[PDB]
Each structure stands twice: as structure tokens, then as C-alpha cells.
Design a protein around this ligand. Structure first.
Ligand code: HEM
Ligand code: NAG
Ligand code: NAG
Ligand code: NAG
Ligand code: NAG
Ligand code: NAG
Ligand code: CL
Ligand code: MG
Length: 327
């Protein structure tokens, strides 16, 4: 059916998104927020359900409407997250912690852990969240945010921009290598870790300006409080990871991992990287999804195949679809 998954916006102009129909509200008891400042902000303004549990279609519509996230990027991220962290039978995903609100769980080894689940979507060297190894991969960390402010002062004239992103991304990688014996920086996380550092410059900057320079009040508002600036206009066109190549090239890194000790970063020659986007997709579906759903029942297999078809619609690179559970 058309509109499943949601298609691109009919009208993708800049407009007021912090409007009277979408007020910021504080959390009620039980409301879930997680490691994504974008989704957190959409939930706290009511572009998504305010309790932080949503369907993939709700998430895709929200990121497009609220931030002008581009359609393919929205589809890929949402169905990737849903496949590994969401309930495929009830069609619900938590944007944070695991919750009974996503419905009766599937059999092990599937975890349905929400976006807080480490190593599926969420991973190491986040800008404002700590690595899961240290015990909290989802809450805003003030010390890490102050480092973002310091890098913005040093490389962005007090604003966050792609130059700042290139330097901060590398700093966070180096700090995880030095401190986290389980540091993993391969495949899907290698991709998302770099792309996410562009998002504040591309999507948190008011759309009437759209100059790639994010002020620190706005940065704190999104990253800490899940709140849009007063009178915030979304970006004037659909985008996501514009300029990711600049961030990647600031300090070229190979994908790899620490091997159970600090300072043991070992390149993984089997990992995808930005030269092999189709390999990233194929490994995600053949390996990561299969590790959660190795031998699904008929009902789960059907749900997997539908969501995998939707995932493939989000692949922006020139790739062939693969079928880990046949056709
Ligand atoms: C389209 C659906 C999306 C999903 C399911 C999603 C989910 C996630 C998840 C699970 C993370 C954790 C990655 C990590 O370990 O650092 C993350 C990172 C992030 N996402 Fe999203 N995201 C989405 C779209 C967006 C959008 C539209 C924005 C901005 C408008 C955004 C901004 C961010 C930022 C800034 C980070 C990194 C935060 C940090 O490192 O401190 N995301 N996302
Ligand atoms: C598109 O939306 C913008 C902002 O709401 C508005 O200025 C413009 O007139 C709209 N165009 C159409 C054709 O609806
Ligand atoms: C580190 O990795 C090991 C796998 O060898 C795992 O058992 C352990 O839970 C990880 N530690 C933390 C704190 O996440
Ligand atoms: C916040 O991050 C800093 C810098 O990595 C870390 O030293 C500190 O333990 C983190 N705070 C919490 C509560 O984990
Ligand atoms: C970041 O800001 C600095 C200082 O204003 C500027 O020199 C640099 O060109 C900016 N980078 C980008 C990508 O806008
Ligand atoms: C994924 O599985 C398909 C067969 O279903 C195969 O053609 C493809 O090469 C596999 N890709 C990887 C990276 O394992
Ligand atoms: Cl689009
Ligand atoms: Mg993380």
C-alpha cells in the first residue's frame, strides 16, 4: 500500500515545528526517553507518542515532519532499529529502555530491548552518552556535553559545525580505545557513529538560517532537555548525513574493536566501511538480524520479511536486496 512505509513529505519547506499543536511537556511517570536526542525531542513535543513507545510509521512521519529528515534515511534507521530492538508482531518500538508496553515478547534469543539495547543500534563513542561498558548508555552526560562545548569553542568559533564534528568524533573514538576494553567500532555502528555527528549541524540548526552552525543553547536544549528552541523552524529541505565524508576524513579510521583490553584496537578486515555500504546492509540482515531471529516461527518469519522489505526501501546506495529468510 502507498504510505506504508510513509513516503516523502508532500511539502518539505521550512516551517515552524515548535508550534501550538506540539508543545514541549515534562515527562510523566513511566515516559521513556533514550539515547537519540532527535526521537526524544519528537516525543517530548508530541510528534511521537509522549510515553516513548511508537510504531515504525509514527517514527518515520515524526522525523520527516519535525526535522525534515530525508525519507530513505528515515526508513532505513527506523526499520533497522525496529528489526533489532522492536516487537515485530505488535509493531511497537521503545525509544529507550525495554518495556512490557511493547507487548508479549518473542522467544529467545530475541531481546526486544528498545533503543537502549547495546550493540544492536546503540553503540560506543557517542558524543553526549557514555559507552554501555561504563553502565549508562542512554542518559545525557554533562561532562561529555561540556567537551562538545569546548570543541565548539576551539574549532567552531563557539558553534558546533562539521569541523567541530570531525575533531570531536575522533576524540571520542580515542577515549573509548583508551578506556573501554569492549570497545566495538565496526559495521553498522561505524556508519551511525559518523553520520550522527553531522545531524546537529544539518537538523538542529533553525531552517530559516540553515548555515550548519549550531549554537550551544540549542545544542543543550536538544541533547539534555529534548526541547526545541523557541520558535524553531525545521530545515528547508529533506536531509540527514550531509557532509559525513568531511567528518570521516578529518581523522581517517579503519573499523575495528578492542579485544578485551584497553589500547588493543584491532582492525576488522571483514567489516564494512563507507566504501562498502551494500556490505553493511547485507551483514546487518544476514548476521545481526539472524542472530536475534535464527529460526523464526511462520508468523515471525512473515513479520521479519515484511520489515526487511521496508528496510531495503531505505537503502540509498546502489545495492541488491538479500533474503535471509527466503521469499
Ligand atoms: C529516524 C529514526 C531514528 C532512530 C530510530 C534513531 C535512533 C538512534 C539511536 C538508537 C542512537 C544511539 C546511537 C549512539 O549510540 O550514539 C541515535 C543517535 C543519535 N541520533 Fe538518532 N535516530 C533516528 C533519527 C534521528 C534524527 C532525525 C535525529 C535528529 C533530528 C537524530 C539525532 C541523533 C543524534 C544526535 C545521535 C547521537 C547522540 C549522541 O551521540 O550523543 N536521530 N539515534
Ligand atoms: C508549503 O509550506 C510552506 C510553509 O508552511 C508554505 O509557505 C507554502 O505555501 C506551502 N506550499 C504549498 C503548495 O502548500
Ligand atoms: C564486556 O564483554 C564481555 C564479553 O567477553 C561481556 O561478558 C561483558 O558483559 C562486557 N562487559 C560490560 C560491562 O558490558
Ligand atoms: C560522564 O562521562 C564522563 C566522561 O567520560 C565520565 O568520566 C563519567 O563517569 C560519566 N558519568 C556517568 C554518570 O557515568
Ligand atoms: C566551523 O566554524 C569555524 C569558525 O567559524 C569555521 O572556520 C569553519 O569553516 C566552520 N566549518 C564549517 C564546516 O562550517
Ligand atoms: C547474505 O545472504 C545472501 C543469500 O541469502 C548472499 O547472497 C549474500 O552474499 C550474503 N551476504 C553476506 C555479506 O553475507
Ligand atoms: Cl525525503
Ligand atoms: Mg552510544
Amino acid at each position: 500500500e502507498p504510505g506504508l512505509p510513509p513516503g516523502p513529505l508532500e511539502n518539505s519547506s521550512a516551517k515552524l515545528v515548535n508550534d501550538e499543536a506540539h508543545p514541549w511537556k515534562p515527562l510523566r511517570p513511566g515516559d521513556i526517553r533514550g539515547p537519540c536526542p532527535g526521537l526524544n525531542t519528537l516525543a517530548s513535543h508530541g510528534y511521537l507518542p509522549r510515553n516513548g513507545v511508537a510504531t515504525p510509521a509514527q517514527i518515520i512521519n515524526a522525523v520527516q515532519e519535525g526535522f525534515n529528515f530525508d525519507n530513505q534515511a528515515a526508513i532505513f534507521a527506523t526499520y533497522a532499529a525496529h528489526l533489532v530492538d522492536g516487537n515485530l508482531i505488535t509493531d511497537l518500538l521503545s525509544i529507550g529502555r525495554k518495556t512490557r508496553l511493547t507487548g508479549p515478547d518473542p522467544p529467545p534469543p530475541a531481546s526486544v530491548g528498545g533503543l537502549n539495547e547495546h550493540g544492536t543500534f546503540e553503540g560506543d563513542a557517542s558524543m553526549t552518552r557514555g559507552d554501555a561498558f561504563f553502565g549508562n548508555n542512554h542518559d545525557f552526560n554533562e561532562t561529555l556535553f561540556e567537551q562538545l562545548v569546548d570543541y565548539s569553542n576551539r574549532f567552531g568559533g563557539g558553534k558546533y559545525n562539521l569541523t567541530v564534528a570531525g575533531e570531536l568524533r575522533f576524540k571520542r573514538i580515542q577515549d573509548s580505545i583508551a578506556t573501554n576494553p569492549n570497545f566495538s567500532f565496526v559495521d553498522f555502528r561505524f556508519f551511525t557513529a559518523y553520520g550522527e555527528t553531522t545531524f546537529p549541524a544539518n537538523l538542529f540548526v533553525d531552517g530559516r538560517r540553515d548555515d550548519g552552525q549550531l549554537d550551544m543553547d540549542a545544542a543543550r536544549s536538544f541533547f539534555q532537555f529534548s526541547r526545541m528552541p523557541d520558535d524553531f523552524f525545521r530545515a528547508p529541505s529533506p536531509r540527514s548525513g550531509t557532509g559525513v565524508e568531511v567528518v570521516v576524513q578529518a581523522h581517517p579510521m579503519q573499523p575495528g574493536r578492542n579485544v578485551g583490553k584497553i589500547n588493543s584496537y584491532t582492525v576488522d578486515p571483514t567489516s564494512s566501511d563507507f566504501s562498502t555500504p551494500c556490505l553493511m546492509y547485507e551483514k546487518f540482515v544476514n548476521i545481526t538480524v539472524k542472530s536475534l531471529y535464527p529460526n523464526p516461527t511462520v508468523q515471525l518469519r512473515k513479520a521479519l520479511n515484511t520489515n526487511l522489505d521496508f528496510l531495503f526501501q531505505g537503502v540509498a546506495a546502489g545495492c541488491t536486496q538479500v533474503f535471509p529468510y527466503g521469499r
